[PDB]
């Protein structure tokens, strides 16, 4: 598991990738095709919240659901 | 949430 202490041990310029590395497989389970885009969207969130989402499945799911609805709305807006 | 975000590529 990724912890606050582990994340702080990393070079600051690496911290988002450490999060993305752990977030992606879970998001890909939920959304196999679009996981890469969704992970990119969530990585904009603050690291503390991302750490919480990594260890709370309900929290991750609800943010992923939001990301998907925003992506779909944007698809209609670009159309 | 920003739908223009850069796509993640996993290692």
Swiss-Prot record, chain A:
Phosphorylated by MAPKAPK2. Ubiquitous. Residues 1-79 are annotated as: (Microbial infection) Binding to HRSV M2-1 protein. Residues 1-76 form the PABC domain. It is found in: Cytoplasm; Cytoplasm, Stress granule; Nucleus; Cell projection, Lamellipodium. Many viruses shutoff host mRNA translational machinery by inhibiting cellular PABPC1 activity using different mechanisms. Picornaviruses, caliciviruses or lentiviruses encode proteases that cleave PABPC1 at several defined sites in the proline-rich linker region between RRMs and the C-terminal domain. Rotaviruses, gammherpesviruses and bunyamwera virus relocalize PABPC1 from the cytoplasm to the nucleus thus altering its function. Many of these viruses translate their mRNA in a PABPC1-independent manner and are unaffected by host PABPC1 inhibition. Belongs to the polyadenylate-binding protein type-1 family. May form homodimers. Component of a multisubunit autoregulatory ribonucleoprotein complex (ARC), at least composed of IGF2BP1, PABPC1 and CSDE1. Directly interacts with IGF2BP1; the interaction is enhanced by SEPIN14P20 peptide RBPR. Part of a complex associated with the FOS mCRD domain and consisting of HNRPD, SYNCRIP, PAIP1 and CSDE1/UNR. Interacts with the PABPC1-interacting motif-1 (PAM1) and -2 (PAM2) of PAIP1 and PAIP2. Interacts with PAIP1 with a 1:1 stoichiometry and with PAIP2 with a 1:2 stoichiometry. The interaction with CSDE1 is direct and RNA-independent. (Microbial infection) Interacts (via C-terminus) with human cytomegalovirus/HHV-5 protein UL69. Binds the poly(A) tail of mRNA, including that of its own transcript, and regulates processes of mRNA metabolism such as pre-mRNA splicing and mRNA stability. Its function in translational initiation regulation can either be enhanced by PAIP1 or repressed by PAIP2. Can probably bind to cytoplasmic RNA sequences other than poly(A) in vivo. Binds to N6-methyladenosine (m6A)-containing mRNAs and contributes to MYC stability by binding to m6A-containing MYC mRNAs. Involved in translationally coupled mRNA turnover. The RNA-binding domains RRM1 and RRM2 and the C-terminus (last 138 amino acids) regions interact with the PABPC1-interacting motif-1 (PAM1) and -2 (PAM2) of PAIP1, respectively. This is Polyadenylate-binding protein 1. It comes from Homo sapiens (Human). The gene is PABPC1.
Swiss-Prot record, chain B:
Residues 1-8 are annotated as: Interaction with PABPC1. It comes from the Eukaryota. It is found in: Cytoplasm, Stress granule; Cytoplasm, Cytosol. Interacts (via N-terminal region) with PABPC1. Interacts with RACK1. RNA binding protein that binds to the poly-A tract of mRNA molecules. Associates with the 40S ribosomal subunit and with polysomes. Plays a role in the regulation of mRNA translation. Plays a role in the regulation of cell morphology and cytoskeletal organization. This is La-related protein 4. The chain holds residues 15 to 25 of 724 of the full protein.
């Amino acid at each position: 598991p990724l912890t606050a202490s582990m994340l702080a041990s990393a070079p600051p310029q690496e911290q988002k990738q450490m999060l993305g590395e752990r977030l992606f497989p879970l998001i890909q389970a939920m959304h196999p095709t679009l996981a890469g885009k969704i992970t990119g969207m969530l990585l904009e969130i603050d690291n503390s919240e991302l750490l919480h989402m990594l260890e709370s499945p309900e929290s991750l799911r609800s943010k992923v659901d939001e990301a998907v609805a925003v992506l779909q709305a944007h698809q209609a807006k670009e159309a | 949430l920003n739908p223009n975000a850069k796509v993640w590529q996993e290692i």
